C-alpha cells in the first residue's frame, strides 16, 4: 500500500571553498510507516550556477557536487516530500 514521507536526514555544508572543490552529498528519506529509505526518490541537487559548476548524484547512489566559479552559489535539492538547502561560496 501507499505511504507518506515524514522527514529526511541531510548533512549539507554551509561554508566557503577556494577555486575548484567538490563534496559528497547524502540524504535519507523517512516514511510514516517507520520505513526509512536512502535516496528513495533520488534527491536531486542543483546549484544557482555562477560561472561553471556541475553536480552528479546518479553515479550509483551517493551524491557529489563540483563547483568551479568565482562567487557565491546556492545549493538546493528536493526528495520525496521533504527538501533541504545549503549555501556555498567559491573564491578565486
Strand order in the sheet with 71-79: 15-17, 82-90, 71-79, 44-47
42 closest CA partner among 12, 62, 67 = 62
Measured distance CA(77)–CA(29) in Å, rounded: 13
The length of the chain is 92
Find the domain containing 33 and state its range.
1-92
The total of other beta-carbon atoms located within 10 Å of residue 49's CB is 13
Total domains in the chain come to 1
Q: Please report, for the domain that includes residue 3, its CATH number.
A: 2.60.40.1080
Amino acid at each position: 500500500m501507499p505511504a507518506a514521507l515524514v522527514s529526511i536526514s541531510v548533512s549539507p555544508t554551509n561554508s566557503t571553498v577556494a577555486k575548484g572543490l567538490q563534496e559528497n552529498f547524502k540524504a535519507t528519506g523517512i516514511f510514516t510507516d517507520n520505513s526509512n529509505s536512502d535516496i528513495t526518490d533520488q534527491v536531486t541537487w542543483d546549484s544557482s550556477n555562477t560561472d561553471i559548476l556541475s553536480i552528479s548524484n546518479a553515479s550509483d547512489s551517493h551524491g557529489l557536487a563540483s563547483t568551479l566559479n568565482q562567487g557565491n552559489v546556492k545549493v538546493t535539492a528536493s526528495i520525496g516530500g521533504i527538501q533541504g538547502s545549503t549555501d556555498f561560496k567559491v573564491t578565486q
